[PDB]
């Protein structure tokens, strides 16, 4: 069943002297004077309009809902008479509060209608009758998913700042009967911010609208609610308004709120006091309350890990992230590359045990043992890594498959120590792959290098989307005429599998095929294998114009930023130290009294920016 | 330790009746009756305001300093009194001529201070009151490197030229105490016009700029210092601000400055007087003081070997360098192709000579010893130019990779002959190999035939950088797979070097792996060389995509003048003539008499510009 639409002057109701279609189709068109007699039917036979009679069958839609939604000149001159007849009626659920109670509208008061029907008349006539404000509406539509919905935040207030109607807002700040708790919340747990940076994309346009909202809310909740801190409250998932637009990466909201600067009245609700500025350079204490890896729930690990999407690697660039990452890399450097050297010569030993195994007797037992200790340490590090981060690979697995490999590689070798200790053979085979693996592996370590990095995750940038989507269809071509091959000179090719690699590595160029000359049946196999060539010739060939189509639209300086963000990564999780020795974490910045007395620990970067200095310039 | 920031209110200050805190807290501020007492105070306890008390611990920083750096309105009524003060109390080491002593801030003293702050109106009070204008600032941050700097010649005037700042140079310029002496000279030897050049970037709008305060400034030294000549002074490298804006790579200023032209008064420092027009064409002479090969240090030698830049090639194709060039390569294009069919004989006679020596005798005997001779020649024609150009290499190798190819080939085919007068065999390798380099290294040549070199250039083109970034990672999937085989194979792939070289020649096409069915574990190789092909296609694929984004960008046009440097390079290097016989180098251009009297040489071009001619028809 579909849900039923909230107003249709066409597909008039349902339904699961005065009946419910003449009272809709009064105050529909609007007119006052027809509801006269209504009350009197009430008193007759003690109906209460939210009874059942009146409202809808599915929704418990009510009338005024009906009204506001049918207006002119943003006005529907029948509802006070509503209110007055309602409070005149004894009612003991008011009506004004009323709400859907359907799956889909769950929660949809009226109110929360004149809000979005721009109408602050009717506002007014409505909360100056006992109307609540409070009433979080927590329907499916209303909640952000693929497809048809709009996602405010559940609450009148909250759908005012995210649609921009700022007269209402002060009205619902500043009225003796009912304010609204600017410090309010949804069932999810978010309040007005956390919305305001739900709906925003990284269009211009609503990202000045959002951020325009944002400053006035937060200078109102200053004046109004000065001693609560609106900002720093977080939600049923544990996280803040920045935090969240991190996470469901929203950035140009991000990047304000990071750097935002305020001067005079409304100073200490800023994050970037200018300290000094000289010329073209301007160094100004940023503060990094909520961004330090040494909180539990780090703005840097969501960024990191937590996140998907693609403009997230855009999020690191900016400043202060930079600059405070660019720290952390030159102080962990040296244990960087350590891990590099120690890792490096587990390869040579392994490389020397694998090229001499079939007192040297000692030299290579030690060895072999020695190679089991790496491998099952090794897999202790990277399982440890999996545990903290569980879901990961499903976020960024193109820049996690190294972590899987590591770990691959110590189960392998390590299921190879324990068979080379057993009788059975396949321990070489198992060995020398993870020697394999391990030397390519060997490139995790590309990063630090700071060019090799840059260049090499072009090498990462070829996607492999393309195989996922390819290899179906090239199985299919090969497996088809494979099998047609074996069944047409069965009575080589004898064993299908067989035949199945000789046409990969035809293919490729590593093994050649076999035309069978003696088989009755020639001139078939020639055409065949004709067919085969020239549609995996195509069919690599459109594999490399879906791969050409990347560069040609022009993009650029990508890499910079994902070279910064695989580093990031790195130092962010060794950060934790190796899960044998915990470490100990080293706070960041220093604290300094600017506010007043409040206190916020800060970092202080020095950033030149010659053509904006002239730019400013007369 | 970081260094201390110059102004923060908020990180107040280090340490390393009136104290040090009241003093800056009333200072910062800026009332003055706070100060009252003061004075009484130092003659009390005979302190200075410069000793260890009020200044900076480390910096050495003053009050001053604190006062200027907070302003209001531009303007800190509290600063005469400071003056009024340090000047009752008789201090021996002036207050206003304090610089700072750390190694960051080094001579930072006030007045480049209200100089950046833009101030008129301090500077007055300051320098009408004993300040000195030549207190040279040679901190590091005022060094120009890489990172937070900010380099502007290490001198108030020429802080301001650098700053747009008109209005304070006319009065640094004017004022009877202390004027500055426009020809000054900072630590390195710059003067303000080196820094104008050193901060420059291609970027148009700083071009402007620069440009408008170099014609300016220009103008006003020569109304003050008529009788010096600010332009042709040098500075501890021994350059000149055109060839200082030539190395470091600044272009649109140093087209500006080699084609500027000013009529009327301040004809004579001018360098291109326009001699007679005729609709389209414009005939003008052009000075060439200090750009001709004739001089110990042109402007030619420093673009074509000293400078490191990309937008070098793109410094010679204007005027009227392109002119000049052309000139002197109608001279000695003969030379040169003799040179040419020199060479190429010494290459005829080791070619024939390696073709039969396995009256015949004589005769080869000669073209032996006569190869010995040649390679001799060559090697010390190649020896004295790296003598000369040590460095180069280092600077462009693209322009000059053939000059280490000669080299090489003289000393590969000189160790042959000594080793052919031994009893050893590798004297043939050796000799075939210098025959092979000697036939390739014939196209140092390409260039005279003034198309093939334009043609040849794209196959320079295609960078080899990315072969030095890549050549790594395939090194890696080939070397550890290599491992893997000949240890699964251990009990051909015997020797490790010659398996890798199999694999190599296979990913080329040359050579045909082999995968022996023999072999226990032949699945296992078969897969593991699909993976080796896999990777390595995928590796080629990246190589080719990150060749291919080059051209796509649309860029245009540049490979001519990429000729026209090359060219330049070789006719400028053979100007000095072959060592042996030492050349006389040619005057150009004629010396005219136009100013009023100033002589200069010139060299007269025709250039026609049909489309600008029209532009200037009405």
Same mark, same amino acid.
């Given at each position: 069943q579909e849900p039923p639409p909230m107003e249709s002057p066409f597909q008039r109701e349902d339904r699961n002297r005065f009946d419910r279609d003449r009272l809709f189709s009064v105050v529909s068109r609007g007119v006052p004077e027809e509801l006269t007699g209504l009350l009197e039917y009430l008193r007759w036979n003690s109906k209460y309009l939210t009874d059942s009679a009146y409202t809808e069958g599915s929704t418990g839609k009510t009338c005024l809902m009906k009204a506001v939604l049918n207006l002119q000149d943003g006005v529907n001159a029948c509802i006070m008479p509503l209110l007055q007849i309602d409070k005149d009626s004894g009612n003991p659920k008011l009506l004004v509060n009323a709400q859907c109670t359907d799956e889909f509208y769950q929660g949809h008061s009226a109110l929360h209608i004149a809000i979005e029907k721009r109408s602050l008349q009717c506002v007014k006539l409505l909360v100056e009758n006992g109307a609540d404000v409070h009433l979080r509406a927590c329907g499916r539509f209303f909640q952000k998913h693929q497809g048809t919905c709009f996602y405010f935040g559940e609450l009148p207030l909250s759908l005012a700042a995210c649609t921009k109607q700022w007269d209402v807002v002060t009205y619902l700040l500043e009225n003796p009967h009912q304010p609204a708790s600017l410090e309010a919340t949804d069932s999810l747990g978010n309040t007005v911010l956390h919305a305001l940076v739900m709906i925003a994309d990284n269009s211009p346009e609503n990202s000045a609208l959002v951020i325009h909202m944002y400053d006035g809310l937060l200078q109102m909740g200053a004046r109004l609610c000065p001693t609560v801190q609106l900002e720093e409250i977080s939600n049923h998932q544990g996280l803040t308004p920045l935090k969240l637009a991190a996470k469901e990466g929203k950035i140009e909201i991000f990047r304000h709120i990071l750097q935002?600067?305020?001067? !005079?009245?409304?100073?200490?609700? +800023?994050?970037?006091?200018?300290?000094?500025?000289? !010329? *073209?350079?301007?160094?100004?204490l940023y503060d990094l309350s909520s961004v330090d890896s040494?909180?539990?729930?780090?703005?840097?690990?969501?960024?990191?890990? /937590?996140?998907?999407? *693609?403009?997230? /690697?855009? %999020?690191?660039?900016?400043?202060?992230?930079?600059?405070?990452?660019?720290?952390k890399w030159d102080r962990l450097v040296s244990r960087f590359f350590f891990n590099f050297a120690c890792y490096l010569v587990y390869m040579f030993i392994f490389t020397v045990v694998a090229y001499h195994? *079939?007192?040297?007797?000692?030299?290579?037992?030690? #060895? /072999?043992?020695? =190679?089991? $200790? #790496?491998? =099952?340490?090794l897999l202790l590090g990277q399982l440890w890594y999996f545990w903290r981060r569980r879901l990961f690979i499903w976020i960024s697995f193109m820049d996690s498959y190294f972590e899987i490999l590591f770990l691959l590689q110590a189960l392998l070798t390590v299921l190879s120590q324990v068979l080379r200790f057993m009788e059975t053979e396949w321990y070489l085979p198992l060995l020398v792959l993870s020697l394999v693996l391990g030397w390519l592996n060997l490139l995790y370590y590309t990063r630090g290098f700071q060019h090799t990095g840059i260049y090499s995750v072009m090498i990462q940038k070829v996607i492999l989307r393309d195989l996922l989507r390819f290899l179906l269809v090239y199985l299919v071509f090969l497996f088809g005429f494979a099998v047609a091959l074996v069944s047409l000179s069965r009575e080589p090719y004898r064993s299908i599998l067989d035949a199945s690699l000789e046409l990969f590595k035809f293919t490729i160029g590593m093994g050649e095929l076999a035309f069978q000359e003696q088989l009755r049946f020639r001139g078939v196999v020639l055409l065949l294998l004709l067919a085969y060539v020239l549609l995996t010739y195509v069919l690599?060939? @459109? %594999?490399?114009?879906?791969? %050409? +189509?990347?560069?040609?639209? /022009?993009?650029? &300086? @990508?890499?910079? +930023? =994902?070279?910064? $963000?695989?580093?990031?990564?790195?130092?962010?999780? %060794?950060? @934790? #130290?190796?899960?044998?020795?915990?470490?100990?974490?080293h706070r960041?910045?220093?604290?300094?009294?600017? #506010?007043? *007395? &409040?206190?916020?620990?800060?970092?202080?970067?020095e950033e030149v920016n010659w053509a904006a200095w002239e730019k400013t310039l007369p």
């Open positions: 935002r600067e305020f001067s !005079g009245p409304y100073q200490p609700l +800023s994050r970037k006091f200018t300290e000094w500025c000289y !010329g *073209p350079v301007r160094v100004s040494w909180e539990k729930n780090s703005v840097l690990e969501i960024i990191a890990f /937590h996140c998907k999407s *693609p403009n997230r /690697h855009r %999020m690191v660039v900016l400043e202060p992230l930079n600059k405070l990452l660019q720290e195994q *079939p007192f040297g007797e000692s030299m290579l037992l030690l #060895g /072999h043992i020695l =190679i089991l $200790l #790496g491998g =099952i340490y690599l060939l @459109n %594999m490399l114009i879906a791969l %050409m +189509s990347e560069t040609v639209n /022009h993009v650029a &300086d @990508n890499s910079w +930023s =994902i070279w910064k $963000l695989q580093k990031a990564i790195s130092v962010l999780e %060794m950060e @934790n #130290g190796y899960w044998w020795c915990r470490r100990k974490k960041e910045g220093r604290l300094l009294k600017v #506010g007043t *007395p &409040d206190e916020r620990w800060c970092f202080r970067v």
